Write a protein that binds this ligand. Structure first.
Ligand SMILES: Cc1nn(CC2CC2)c(C)c1-c1cncc(-c2ccnc3nc[nH]c23)c1
Length: 123
């Protein structure tokens, strides 16, 4: 069975509208989203569909760009660091579960390089 996705709405969280948070959605996430290798990361890993019944026995904090996008849209992140942490969790989960040279690892490595380029300078 797939687990429920990470939470994306929480009215009790502290909330703020900042330039960097806006930039992380408008520029960083929305640009990564259009990359040719973004598709595996646009929604939670469907371990049932992908026949990966061990994925959610190994990965304990799942993360994906669809979840990140919903979080940004709900002002779930107080600051850019919290959002950047979720991107890094997403890449790290991929490198934990898979091995160097796997197609999915090549895809994540490409996206991570672009991500680091795009967050090198924030407003
Ligand atoms: C690329 C690719 N290649 N293949 C066929 C090759 C394996 C025999 C498959 C089934 C995929 C693929 C498709 N959709 C999502 C994922 C995925 C997304 C995030 N983390 C993952 N960890 C393991 N998979 C992950 C991967």
């Amino acid at each position: 069975m797939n687990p429920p996705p990470p939470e994306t709405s929480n009215p009790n969280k502290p909330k703020r509208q900042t330039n960097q948070l806006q930039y992380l959605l408008r520029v960083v996430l929305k640009t990564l989203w259009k990359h040719q290798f973004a598709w595996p990361f646009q929604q939670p890993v469907d371990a049932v569909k992908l026949n990966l019944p061990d994925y959610y026995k190994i990965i304990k904090t799942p993360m994906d760009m669809g979840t990140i996008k919903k979080r940004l849209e709900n002002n779930y992140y107080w600051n850019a660091q919290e959002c950047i942490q979720d991107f890094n969790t997403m890449f790290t989960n991929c490198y934990i579960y898979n091995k160097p040279g796997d197609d999915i690892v090549l895809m994540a490595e490409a996206l991570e390089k672009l991500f680091l380029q795009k967050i090198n300078e924030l407003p």
